[PDB]
Amino acid sequence: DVTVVYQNGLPVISVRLPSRRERCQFTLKPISDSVGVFLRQLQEEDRGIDRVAI
Amino acid sequence: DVTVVYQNGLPVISVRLPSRRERCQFTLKPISDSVGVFLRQLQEEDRGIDRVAIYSPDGVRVAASTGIDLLLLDDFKLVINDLTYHVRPPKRDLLSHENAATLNDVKT
Amino acid sequence: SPDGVRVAASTGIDLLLLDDFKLVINDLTYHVRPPKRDLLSHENAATLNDVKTLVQQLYTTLCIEQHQLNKERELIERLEDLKEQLAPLEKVRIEISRKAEKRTTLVLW
Amino acid sequence: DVTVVYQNGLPVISVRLPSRRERCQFTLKPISDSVGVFLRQLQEEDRGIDRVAIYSPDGVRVAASTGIDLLLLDDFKLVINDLTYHVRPPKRDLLSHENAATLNDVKTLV
Amino acid sequence: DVTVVYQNGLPVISVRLPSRRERCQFTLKPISDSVGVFLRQLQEEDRGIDRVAIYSPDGVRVAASTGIDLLLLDDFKLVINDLTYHVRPPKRDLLSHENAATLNDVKTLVQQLYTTLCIEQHQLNKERELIERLEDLKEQLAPLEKVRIEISRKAEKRTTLVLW
Amino acid sequence: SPDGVRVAASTGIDLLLLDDFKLVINDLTYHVRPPKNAATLNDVKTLV
């Protein structure tokens, strides 16, 4: 499943991408990052993510 | 897995798309369709497919121009990403190969 | 389809409307069942469906469209065979049809 | 490494594409096609191919829009980015004696 | 094989490319650049490269946004169209892991505060208090400005007389 | 690059000229010597 844990001051989130059944991880800077930009990083990571919301 | 079977004069190909683990099915006109357009049709169905190619059973990669009829004559490996579904259901009735025979069966 | 499999992005409408089919929105599954009106005998449709593919194979088992394009290409060269033989006869006729015309404009004057 | 064989009266080249070390096999229409459009296909299987050309042993460049049957009937150099394979095209089998006659009826019916 | 060695204090990735098998090298600023750029840069250097994805030492793959230095901290497998080049970057962490941890503890612990009580929201309010204070004086100047615009005009209209 | 390693086709111009290299045209090797920020443990002691 999904888990988030902090590393080097930033939180990394190891989502489970749908295609490739792959487990990608994101280092997102939580001061100047809206979900509006963390999601793009999901889709543009593997466009197979049709819809994604929180 | 993946299987191809004929319906209403055309072959339907019921691949399993990766995202959502759906089982999409394409009807593809075996005359005016090259794998160059069945694949591009396969991606745009669900863009989550990095690479998609078609392998003749001996590892040799099928082209991007062969017409599906030319391909459907035998089996072939359809590889989407890491997975390799090798379809061998095309149910070729090429038992006789006899043009005189099939024509006789046609007219029959 | 009536079951889980997904209709592609290229299936023709009539090829789809043959039976009922679930149509899904962003969060809903509208369950559509169009009126069935083909009325061709199902088994007969099959024995025709057999014919269609059976011809289809014959059409490509022996590369017809490779032979059609050959037949046409054989026609071109024949045209380009005659159109060659014309080139000698054309000049000597372009000559006379000038000379014998150069007279008829004289007598015309 | 390059081979030309025949499936269903059609030539089937077997190149050795660079980017994957993977053999792709085109089929060619010896009438409609042309090295002008065959090369274009040879690109679209691996864009990593940039300097690609093809020519007869002496003839240093068979021009585009050359009938494939012209090229096909004799060996030729196939130049991929650096590897230049020389093909061994098979001499077409001759069965056009009289079957073609009774076949040219079959074909024009189907 | 591929490897990264530092030069000028920058990382130079000495990759081997599939199409043109010839060791091309990449430079990349460990701050401004991110894998989403270097990868995409390597994506455009060659063409036959079709699907590249940089992988953590295990199955986990890195994002398209992780900063290079955040990646170069340890080993990582880099995958080309059909191969898994296994990079081993030079160990350059140069900080006690526990101390690195207790600082990593601080960094988050600060920001947690920085957003627990909308500190960012308070800075704007501070400035928005400065604007009005300026706009409190600047308007309070508008009465005195008129009479001083007149006086200045008059006293100047008189000094140009004596000047003449 | 001096080691014969072909530099990237999109490396930084400044990073190119930051060091010696060997520009080439069809045959030549115009060996050119133009004139004259990774995070580190030394620097981190300063932030603390």
XYZ file of C-alpha atoms in Angstrom:
593
model
C 0.000 0.000 0.000
C 0.883 3.683 0.248
C 3.128 4.978 3.009
C 4.868 8.290 3.631
C 7.964 8.742 5.779
C 10.431 11.579 6.159
C 13.946 11.447 4.747
C 16.467 14.300 4.706
C 13.901 16.818 5.915
C 11.395 16.004 3.211
C 8.604 13.427 3.145
C 8.889 10.658 0.569
C 5.668 8.901 -0.408
C 5.920 5.430 -1.949
C 2.684 5.158 -3.917
C 1.845 1.995 -5.883
C 1.563 3.004 -9.524
C -1.107 1.058 -11.433
C 0.820 0.168 -14.566
C 3.889 -2.069 -14.308
C 2.386 -2.804 -10.883
C 5.237 -0.530 -9.874
C 5.922 1.192 -6.559
C 7.090 4.734 -7.260
C 8.183 7.215 -4.604
C 7.983 11.009 -4.581
C 10.088 13.575 -2.747
C 7.696 16.516 -2.534
C 8.694 19.796 -0.879
C 5.801 20.426 1.517
C 6.324 24.199 1.805
C 5.648 25.199 -1.808
C 3.723 22.210 -3.171
C -0.026 22.094 -3.476
C -1.714 18.788 -4.174
C -2.356 20.555 -7.464
C 1.286 19.850 -8.269
C 1.837 16.570 -6.439
C -0.842 14.995 -8.621
C 0.748 16.084 -11.899
C 3.854 14.325 -10.637
C 1.694 11.215 -10.330
C 0.070 11.376 -13.757
C 3.147 12.559 -15.645
C 5.016 9.766 -13.878
C 2.813 7.149 -15.561
C -0.050 8.557 -17.633
C -2.120 5.407 -17.087
C -3.504 7.074 -13.977
C -6.829 8.103 -15.484
C -8.233 10.023 -12.523
C -6.464 10.764 -9.258
C -7.799 12.679 -6.279
C -7.265 12.952 -2.541
C -4.778 -13.886 -20.940
C -5.321 -12.509 -24.439
C -7.456 -14.242 -27.046
C -8.645 -13.458 -30.562
C -11.884 -14.770 -32.034
C -13.930 -13.794 -35.065
C -17.273 -12.036 -34.778
C -19.395 -10.573 -37.578
C -16.648 -11.090 -40.139
C -14.016 -9.307 -38.059
C -11.654 -10.559 -35.361
C -12.137 -9.208 -31.854
C -8.962 -9.181 -29.777
C -9.659 -9.119 -26.036
C -6.348 -7.972 -24.564
C -5.955 -7.215 -20.848
C -5.025 -3.585 -20.354
C -2.621 -2.940 -17.464
C -4.275 0.023 -15.763
C -7.460 -0.943 -13.900
C -6.596 -4.498 -15.023
C -9.386 -4.084 -17.549
C -9.986 -6.455 -20.453
C -10.431 -4.276 -23.517
C -11.410 -5.740 -26.878
C -10.663 -4.328 -30.324
C -12.380 -5.053 -33.611
C -9.750 -4.454 -36.273
C -10.301 -4.585 -40.023
C -7.738 -7.144 -41.255
C -7.443 -5.413 -44.660
C -6.797 -1.737 -43.891
C -5.033 -2.176 -40.544
C -1.319 -2.542 -39.985
C 0.044 -3.326 -36.546
C 1.256 0.248 -36.842
C -2.368 1.263 -36.284
C -3.577 -1.552 -34.040
C -0.837 -0.703 -31.553
C -1.378 3.052 -31.661
C -5.024 2.142 -31.163
C -3.973 0.000 -28.208
C -2.052 2.793 -26.492
C -4.610 5.573 -26.967
C -7.113 3.218 -25.372
C -5.098 3.596 -22.150
C -1.891 5.638 -22.325
C -0.346 3.766 -19.400
C 1.522 1.545 -21.835
C 5.180 2.520 -22.151
C 6.105 0.199 -24.999
C 3.982 -2.262 -26.927
C 5.333 -4.529 -29.645
C 4.450 -7.788 -31.355
C 6.806 -10.751 -31.569
C 6.636 -13.606 -34.015
C 7.043 -16.825 -31.987
C 10.808 -16.859 -32.607
C 11.681 -13.629 -30.811
C 11.857 -11.748 -34.098
C 9.821 -8.575 -33.786
C 6.941 -8.063 -36.168
C 7.147 -4.849 -38.138
C 5.092 -1.680 -37.817
C 3.540 -2.155 -41.264
C 2.443 -5.781 -41.674
C -1.296 -6.058 -42.138
C -3.107 -7.876 -39.364
C -4.341 -10.520 -41.797
C -0.709 -11.286 -42.595
C -0.046 -11.543 -38.864
C -3.199 -13.417 -37.841
C -2.228 -16.329 -40.113
C -0.347 -17.853 -37.173
C 0.264 -17.186 -33.508
C 2.292 -14.281 -32.184
C 3.627 -12.862 -28.938
C 1.925 -9.613 -27.956
C 4.100 -7.858 -25.391
C 2.875 -4.821 -23.406
C 5.582 -3.520 -20.981
C 7.229 -6.452 -19.064
C 4.303 -8.910 -19.699
C 4.272 -11.134 -22.820
C 0.880 -12.579 -23.643
C 1.453 -14.912 -26.577
C -1.819 -15.352 -28.429
C -2.289 -18.651 -30.139
C -6.088 -18.719 -30.517
C -6.337 -17.164 -34.028
C -8.074 -20.441 -34.898
C -6.617 -20.603 -38.376
C -8.707 -22.987 -40.461
C -5.648 -23.417 -42.711
C -5.968 -27.189 -42.673
C -6.163 -27.733 -46.433
C -4.673 -24.451 -47.735
C -6.330 -25.575 -50.982
C -7.718 -22.585 -52.854
C -9.801 -24.957 -54.969
C -11.204 -26.475 -51.777
C -12.055 -23.381 -49.725
C -13.642 -21.790 -52.787
C -15.758 -24.923 -53.083
C -16.575 -24.539 -49.393
C -17.271 -20.851 -50.018
C -19.691 -21.526 -52.863
C -21.189 -24.310 -50.747
C -20.175 -4.955 -22.841
C -22.909 -6.751 -20.872
C -19.965 -8.094 -18.873
C -16.762 -6.488 -17.665
C -14.822 -6.306 -20.931
C -14.341 -2.819 -22.342
C -15.405 -1.804 -25.826
C -12.440 -0.306 -27.649
C -12.161 3.209 -29.055
C -12.655 2.001 -32.627
C -15.639 -0.372 -32.636
C -18.311 0.843 -35.017
C -21.603 1.865 -33.458
C -23.719 -0.662 -35.346
C -21.185 -3.335 -34.425
C -21.820 -2.308 -30.810
C -25.565 -1.614 -30.772
C -26.230 -5.280 -31.612
C -26.719 -5.940 -27.890
C -27.072 -4.082 -24.616
C -24.023 -2.381 -23.161
C -23.227 -0.573 -19.924
C -22.181 3.040 -20.422
C -20.155 4.511 -17.507
C -19.845 8.236 -16.549
C -17.278 9.654 -14.066
C -19.049 7.972 -11.074
C -22.104 6.114 -12.540
C -22.935 3.073 -14.723
C -25.909 3.913 -16.911
C -27.172 0.529 -18.094
C -28.195 0.924 -21.742
C -30.090 -1.630 -23.839
C -30.691 -0.454 -27.406
C -33.567 -1.908 -29.443
C -32.615 -5.097 -31.261
C -33.485 -4.761 -34.938
C -30.998 -6.738 -37.068
C -33.401 -9.709 -37.139
C -31.071 -11.764 -39.338
C -31.222 -15.407 -38.287
C -28.465 -15.820 -35.723
C -27.153 -19.137 -37.027
C -27.492 -17.788 -40.565
C -25.526 -14.732 -39.480
C -22.871 -17.218 -38.377
C -22.815 -19.130 -41.656
C -22.411 -15.733 -43.285
C -19.867 -14.661 -40.669
C -18.045 -17.827 -41.690
C -18.082 -16.727 -45.332
C -16.723 -13.239 -44.648
C -13.593 -14.444 -42.865
C -13.290 -17.450 -45.167
C -12.978 -15.076 -48.111
C -10.770 -12.728 -46.085
C -8.205 -15.493 -45.661
C -8.326 -16.370 -49.354
C -7.847 -12.677 -50.083
C -4.522 -12.603 -48.242
C -3.443 -16.250 -48.283
C -2.340 -15.546 -51.862
C -1.611 -11.789 -51.778
C -4.404 -10.642 -54.097
C -3.800 -6.911 -53.713
C -0.233 -7.785 -54.635
C -1.600 -9.276 -57.857
C -4.141 -6.521 -58.526
C -1.373 -3.936 -58.356
C 0.569 -6.243 -60.656
C -2.317 -6.372 -63.134
C -2.558 -2.584 -63.140
C 1.217 -2.279 -63.439
C 1.058 -4.639 -66.408
C -1.441 -2.243 -67.963
C 0.839 0.780 -67.511
C 3.750 -0.798 -69.364
C 1.448 -1.832 -72.209
C 0.330 1.780 -72.467
C 4.005 2.714 -72.190
C 4.703 0.111 -74.869
C 2.299 1.600 -77.409
C 3.078 5.199 -76.430
C 6.627 4.256 -77.382
C 5.744 2.918 -80.842
C 3.762 6.124 -81.344
C 6.812 8.368 -80.919
C 8.323 7.390 -84.321
C 4.998 7.500 -86.145
C 4.084 10.737 -84.376
C 7.003 12.770 -85.730
C 6.540 11.766 -89.372
C 2.847 12.529 -88.931
C 3.493 15.785 -87.062
C 5.648 16.652 -90.065
C 3.053 15.878 -92.745
C 0.161 17.257 -90.702
C 2.223 20.428 -90.793
C 3.159 20.265 -94.479
C -0.226 19.116 -95.774
C -1.606 21.848 -93.530
C 0.854 24.428 -94.854
C -0.720 23.799 -98.257
C -4.345 24.018 -97.147
C -3.633 27.422 -95.623
C -2.134 28.543 -98.931
C -5.130 27.452 -101.013
C -7.249 28.968 -98.252
C -5.503 32.268 -98.946
C 22.512 -11.229 -40.021
C 20.207 -9.723 -42.639
C 18.010 -12.232 -44.442
C 15.280 -11.991 -47.062
C 12.776 -14.837 -47.186
C 9.301 -15.318 -48.622
C 6.029 -15.698 -46.733
C 2.812 -15.785 -48.765
C 4.511 -14.567 -51.924
C 5.903 -11.599 -50.019
C 9.502 -10.731 -49.118
C 10.190 -10.569 -45.387
C 13.431 -8.798 -44.501
C 14.936 -9.627 -41.094
C 17.033 -6.650 -39.980
C 19.047 -6.562 -36.733
C 17.872 -3.328 -35.147
C 20.514 -1.580 -33.015
C 18.627 0.000 -30.130
C 17.434 -3.302 -28.660
C 19.651 -5.867 -30.393
C 16.281 -7.191 -31.531
C 15.399 -8.541 -34.960
C 12.470 -6.795 -36.626
C 10.978 -8.308 -39.779
C 9.178 -6.144 -42.285
C 7.135 -7.454 -45.155
C 7.478 -5.692 -48.487
C 5.156 -5.169 -51.426
C 7.527 -5.801 -54.349
C 5.273 -3.632 -56.533
C 3.723 -0.864 -54.438
C 6.629 -0.340 -52.045
C 9.910 1.446 -52.714
C 13.184 1.861 -50.848
C 12.030 5.447 -50.465
C 9.176 4.221 -48.277
C 10.859 1.044 -47.025
C 13.653 3.037 -45.397
C 11.059 5.328 -43.817
C 9.610 2.208 -42.210
C 13.037 0.986 -41.108
C 13.253 4.254 -39.191
C 9.916 3.886 -37.416
C 10.993 0.710 -35.648
C 13.957 2.399 -33.957
C 14.349 6.169 -34.120
C 17.923 5.591 -32.947
C 18.728 4.942 -36.614
C 19.868 8.191 -38.241
C 22.365 7.519 -41.060
C 20.711 4.656 -42.929
C 20.946 3.934 -46.643
C 21.035 1.035 -49.057
C 22.609 0.308 -52.415
C 23.808 -2.341 -54.843
C 27.424 -3.590 -54.679
C 28.846 -1.120 -57.207
C 25.954 1.347 -57.422
C 26.738 3.453 -54.388
C 23.176 4.693 -53.866
C 19.994 3.170 -55.236
C 17.743 6.207 -55.311
C 14.464 6.470 -53.459
C 11.232 5.460 -55.203
C 13.024 2.477 -56.731
C 10.772 -0.511 -57.323
C 11.487 -3.021 -54.578
C 11.578 -5.849 -57.111
C 14.440 -4.024 -58.834
C 16.445 -3.855 -55.609
C 15.258 -7.307 -54.567
C 16.506 -9.275 -57.582
C 20.170 -8.812 -56.613
C 22.254 -8.542 -53.473
C 22.858 -5.117 -51.995
C 24.535 -3.323 -49.130
C 22.217 -2.341 -46.282
C 23.854 0.503 -44.370
C 22.695 1.073 -40.829
C 24.390 3.768 -38.749
C 27.737 2.047 -39.029
C 27.072 -1.624 -39.772
C 26.610 -2.228 -43.495
C 25.131 -5.669 -44.062
C 25.134 -7.174 -47.536
C 21.980 -9.177 -48.116
C 21.614 -12.505 -49.927
C 18.182 -12.150 -51.565
C 16.760 -15.494 -52.674
C 16.227 -16.157 -56.349
C 12.460 -16.214 -56.807
C 10.966 -19.648 -57.384
C 9.413 -20.009 -60.838
C 5.976 -21.642 -60.843
C 4.342 -19.237 -63.333
C 4.394 -21.848 -66.126
C 0.673 -22.649 -66.306
C -0.639 -22.669 -62.719
C -0.685 -18.869 -62.909
C -3.193 -19.217 -65.752
C -5.605 -21.348 -63.738
C -4.588 -19.313 -60.685
C -5.225 -15.975 -62.398
C -8.790 -17.228 -62.705
C -8.939 -18.142 -59.013
C -7.491 -14.794 -57.939
C -9.799 -12.687 -60.090
C -12.734 -14.587 -58.585
C -11.864 -14.321 -54.893
C 29.223 -0.089 -17.863
C 28.297 3.368 -16.607
C 29.589 5.338 -13.654
C 29.511 8.846 -12.233
C 32.664 10.646 -11.118
C 32.833 14.138 -9.685
C 34.521 16.970 -11.557
C 34.828 20.586 -10.389
C 32.515 19.461 -7.601
C 29.833 18.472 -10.130
C 28.689 14.942 -10.996
C 29.582 13.679 -14.467
C 27.550 10.613 -15.412
C 29.499 8.540 -17.941
C 26.624 6.668 -19.527
C 26.844 4.274 -22.473
C 24.215 4.784 -25.016
C 22.446 1.895 -26.772
C 22.077 3.200 -30.325
C 25.488 4.841 -30.680
C 27.470 2.544 -28.429
C 29.950 5.179 -27.298
C 30.402 6.551 -23.802
C 28.519 9.832 -23.707
C 28.813 11.814 -20.486
C 26.305 14.097 -18.794
C 26.804 16.998 -16.419
C 24.033 18.133 -14.123
C 23.834 20.668 -11.325
C 22.965 18.699 -8.169
C 20.631 21.507 -7.067
C 18.784 23.054 -10.003
C 18.543 19.874 -12.067
C 16.331 16.917 -11.217
C 16.052 13.396 -12.604
C 13.000 14.635 -14.487
C 15.513 16.702 -16.467
C 18.638 14.545 -16.608
C 16.580 11.511 -17.581
C 14.681 13.542 -20.163
C 18.051 14.947 -21.233
C 19.417 11.446 -21.753
C 16.031 10.790 -23.361
C 16.845 13.325 -26.070
C 20.581 12.670 -26.403
C 19.790 9.357 -28.076
C 16.624 8.269 -29.865
C 16.432 4.474 -29.598
C 16.129 5.149 -25.912
C 12.382 4.742 -25.493
C 11.674 4.063 -21.814
C 14.167 4.958 -19.081
C 13.371 4.921 -15.381
C 15.849 5.403 -12.560
C 15.465 2.818 -9.811
C 16.279 2.756 -6.112
C 18.581 -0.084 -4.967
C 15.406 -2.186 -4.800
C 12.202 -2.396 -6.840
C 11.166 1.124 -5.854
C 11.650 3.624 -8.655
C 12.449 7.273 -8.124
C 10.058 9.987 -9.227
C 10.452 12.563 -11.973
C 11.110 15.275 -9.390
C 13.669 13.950 -6.892
C 16.691 16.217 -6.819
C 19.909 14.689 -8.085
C 21.808 15.033 -4.814
C 18.868 13.434 -3.013
C 19.330 10.566 -5.455
C 23.133 10.398 -5.592
C 23.214 9.813 -1.831
C 23.420 6.065 -2.452
C 23.518 3.438 -5.175
C 20.765 3.255 -7.769
C 20.025 1.093 -10.801
C 19.456 3.011 -14.022
C 17.376 1.206 -16.637
C 17.704 1.905 -20.390
C 15.274 0.547 -23.040
C 16.395 -3.109 -22.501
C 19.137 -3.103 -19.779
C 19.677 -2.369 -16.056
C 22.900 -0.415 -15.743
C 23.839 -0.618 -12.069
C 25.298 2.724 -11.012
C 27.413 3.012 -7.851
C 27.981 6.732 -7.264
C 30.922 7.799 -5.088
C 30.082 7.859 -1.389
C 30.066 11.538 -0.437
C 27.463 11.897 2.337
C 30.060 13.188 4.821
C 27.839 13.494 7.883
C 27.259 11.232 10.883
C 24.076 9.313 10.145
C 22.712 9.859 13.652
C 23.648 13.531 13.424
C 22.199 13.536 9.918
C 19.104 12.042 11.538
C 18.918 14.500 14.426
C 19.171 17.283 11.857
C 16.584 15.563 9.670
C 14.507 15.544 12.842
C 14.971 19.307 13.142
C 14.151 20.208 9.534
C 10.680 18.671 9.642
C 10.118 19.724 13.249
C 10.661 23.329 12.162
C 8.320 23.246 9.176
C 5.688 21.397 11.195
C 5.607 24.527 13.327
C 5.896 26.754 10.257
C 2.506 25.452 9.121
C 0.909 24.345 12.399
C 0.275 28.006 13.230
C 0.051 29.505 9.727
C 3.323 31.391 10.092
C 3.351 31.973 6.345
C -0.099 33.494 6.763
C 1.255 35.809 9.453
C 4.056 37.247 7.303
C 1.536 38.460 4.732
C -0.496 40.047 7.518
C 2.623 41.789 8.819
C 3.272 43.260 5.384
C -0.436 44.008 4.969
C -0.074 45.931 8.208
C 2.861 47.845 6.749
C 0.983 48.819 3.574
C -1.895 50.390 5.478
C 0.508 52.227 7.791
C 2.138 53.701 4.704
C -1.345 54.278 3.295
C -2.246 55.822 6.647
C 0.558 58.381 6.463
C 0.520 58.947 2.702
C -3.128 59.988 2.860
C -2.431 62.029 5.996
C 0.167 63.809 3.850
C -2.360 64.718 1.142
C -3.783 67.689 3.123
C -0.370 69.111 4.006
C 0.885 68.448 0.482
C -1.675 70.786 -1.080
C -0.817 73.815 1.053
C 2.890 73.078 0.648
C 2.413 72.703 -3.102
C 0.830 76.154 -3.039
C 3.369 77.771 -0.689
C 6.218 76.279 -2.699
C 4.601 77.540 -5.892
C 4.110 81.022 -4.446
C 7.516 81.341 -2.788
C 9.015 80.029 -6.021
C 6.976 82.424 -8.151
C 8.471 85.159 -5.977
C 12.066 83.944 -6.165
C 11.919 83.813 -9.952
C 10.922 87.480 -9.840
C 13.955 88.520 -7.788
C 15.967 86.193 -10.016
C 14.785 88.272 -12.965
C 35.743 15.810 -23.738
C 39.549 15.502 -23.277
C 39.238 11.800 -22.484
C 37.597 11.306 -25.880
C 34.288 10.830 -24.072
C 31.732 12.607 -26.226
C 30.021 15.225 -24.080
C 26.232 15.317 -24.010
C 24.280 17.128 -26.690
C 22.537 19.180 -24.021
C 25.166 19.860 -21.357
C 25.627 23.402 -20.114
C 27.654 25.729 -22.334
C 29.373 27.168 -19.267
C 30.075 23.657 -17.991
C 31.593 22.923 -21.395
C 33.960 25.908 -21.457
C 34.654 25.433 -17.737
C 37.385 22.971 -18.754
C 39.568 21.824 -21.621
C 38.057 19.687 -24.387
C 38.526 18.855 -28.082
C 35.930 20.308 -30.416
C 35.877 18.447 -33.723
C 34.630 19.020 -37.249
C 34.553 16.335 -39.972
C 38.247 15.589 -39.464
C 39.899 18.222 -37.273
C 40.390 18.389 -33.497
C 40.427 22.065 -32.475
C 41.817 21.378 -29.024
C 40.690 24.453 -27.102
C 41.792 25.613 -23.640
C 39.356 28.359 -22.591
C 40.240 30.465 -19.540
C 38.615 30.461 -16.101
C 28.402 23.772 -5.870
C 27.540 20.208 -4.767
C 26.172 20.195 -1.157
C 28.936 19.205 1.341
C 29.439 18.280 5.046
C 31.716 21.329 5.503
C 28.894 23.663 4.342
C 26.235 21.955 6.503
C 28.165 22.781 9.706
C 27.699 26.396 8.638
C 23.912 26.200 8.451
C 23.613 24.586 11.842
